[PDB]
Symmetry: D2
Subunit: 120 residues, 4 copies
Amino acid sequence: GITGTWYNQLGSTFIVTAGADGALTGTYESAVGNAESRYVLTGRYDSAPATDGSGTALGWTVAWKNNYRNAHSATTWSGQYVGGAEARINTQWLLTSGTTEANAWKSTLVGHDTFTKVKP
Amino acid sequence: GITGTWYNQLGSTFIVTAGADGALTGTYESAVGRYVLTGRYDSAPATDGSGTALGWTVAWKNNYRNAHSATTWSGQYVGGAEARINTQWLLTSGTTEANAWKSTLVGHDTFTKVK
Amino acid sequence: AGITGTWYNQLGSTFIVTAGADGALTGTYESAVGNAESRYVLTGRYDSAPATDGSGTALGWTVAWKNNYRNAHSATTWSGQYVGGAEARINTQWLLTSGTTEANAWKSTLVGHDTFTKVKP
Amino acid sequence: GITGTWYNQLGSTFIVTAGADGALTGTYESAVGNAESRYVLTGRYDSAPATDGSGTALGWTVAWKNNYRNAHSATTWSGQYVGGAEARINTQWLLTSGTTEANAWKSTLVGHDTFTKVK
Ligand SMILES: COC(=O)c1cccc(-c2cc3c(=O)[nH]ccc3o2)c1
Ligand SMILES: COC(=O)c1cccc(-c2cc3c(=O)[nH]ccc3o2)c1
Ligand SMILES: COC(=O)c1cccc(-c2cc3c(=O)[nH]ccc3o2)c1
Ligand SMILES: COC(=O)c1cccc(-c2cc3c(=O)[nH]ccc3o2)c1
C-alpha cells in the first residue's frame, strides 16, 4: 500500500506511513531547492477507497525548515496512489514562499511529481 | 497568530492549532462539495514583513461521508489588524487511469478571522 | 456589455481585448509587475455561443513577454470565464512559464489568480 | 523548430505554425482526426529565446467549440519548447468550464501534457 519508501522522478526520497486513522506521517528529503537532510511531513489519505479500480486520494505538506536550513516556504502534494505491479503515486504540487504583499503574486510555483518504489 | 478559527469566502470554517514543532492540526467544515486536517507551517518566519508559509490537507472522509478525494491548501499567513491566510488549493479525486487526466481541480481560498 | 473592452486586474495591469465573431481574442496587455514595460501582444479564444442556463463564458489567452523594449523569456496563460452582470467580471487562473535549463525546469512555472473588471479598482 | 505536428501522451494531435512575429496558429484534434474533433488554437511564443541552453517559453488556448459541438470550456497550455533530436514541448494546462457562480469553485481542472514530434 501507501506505507513505504518512495522516490520521485528527480530523486527525492519520500518515507511515509499510512496510519489506521487516515494519517500520513514521515520524512521527505529533496534533491533540489534550498534543502538539506530530512524534513517532517504530515498529511491525510482516504482510508476506505472505492472498490471499482479507482486510485486512493491523498495529500501531504512539507514546510522547508529543519535544524540545518529554513527556506521560509512550504510544498503541498495532492494526488492519488495507484496500486498494482509497479505501484505509483501521481501528484501535482504547489510551493508557496513567504513574501511581502507586493511580491505575493509570484509566491507560488506549480508542478507535478510521480513517485515509485524504485530510484529513477 | 495562526491558532484559532478561520473562515473562507464560501462559508467554510477552518479550526487550527499551530504547534511549537511546526504542526498544524484541527478540523475543517465545508459549505460545498467536520473533517480532520493536518499540515505544517514555518515556525521561524522572517521578521521583515514577509508572510508565514504553510500548508495543510483534508481527506474528505469522516464517519458519515466519503467523497474519495482530498484537498491541499498551500499559502501564507499574513498578520496585522486584518489578518489573512491566503491560499491556492488542489483537489484530487480517486479515479481510474482513463479518467486521471481530469482528476484534479485547482482554485484559491482566502481566510479571515471574522466571518 | 460583453468581453470586448478595456479591463483592469487587482494589481493594476491593463487588458485591452476584442472578442471577434469567430471566437478570437486579440489585443494588448500591460503589466504593473515583473520584467515588463509598455504593451504586449495577446491572442486567445472564447466560447462564442455560451450556455443559456446562467453560466459564464469560458475563455483563455496568452502573452509572451517580448516586445520592442524588453524580453523576459517567459509567457503567461490566463484561463477563466466572463461573468456578466451589473459589475461585469472576468475571473481567471494563470500559469507563467519561464524558459529554463532542464535542471531548473522543476521551478519554471508560477501559478496565481487574476480578477478583471471594467472599472479600475 | 516549433512549426509542425505534435502528439501528446494521450492521443491528441496539434499542427501549429510559429510565425516570425511570435504568433502560434493552428488546429488541435484527436488521434483519428475526424472533423468533429478539430478545434482552432491560437497562442504566442518567445521568438527570440535565450542562447544559453534554456527552453523557449510559449502558450496557447483552445476553446472547445467547433461547427459540430460545444463543451462550453477552454484549455490553456503554458510551457516551453526544447529542441534537438528528441524535441519536446513540456506543458501544464488549465481547463476552465463556464459555470454559475455557485459552481465556480469547481470550474477549473489542472494537468500536464508532454508533446513529441513522433506518436
Ligand atoms: C522555492 O522552493 C524552495 O524554497 C524549496 C526548498 C527546498 C525544497 C523544495 C522542493 C523540493 C520539491 C520536490 O521534491 N517536489 C516538488 C517541489 C519541491 O520543492 C523547494
Ligand atoms: C469529490 O469531492 C469534492 O470535490 C469535495 C468534497 C467535499 C468538500 C470539498 C471541498 C471543500 C473546499 C473548500 O472549502 N475549499 C477548497 C476546496 C474545497 O473542496 C470537495
Ligand atoms: C516570471 O515572470 C515574468 O517573467 C514576467 C514578466 C512580465 C510580466 C509578468 C506578469 C504579469 C502578470 C499579470 O498581470 N498577471 C499574472 C501574471 C503576470 O505575469 C511576468
Ligand atoms: C470534456 O470537457 C472538456 O472540457 C473537454 C472537451 C474536449 C476536449 C478536452 C481536452 C483535451 C485536452 C488535452 O489534450 N490536454 C489537456 C486538456 C484537454 O482537454 C476537454
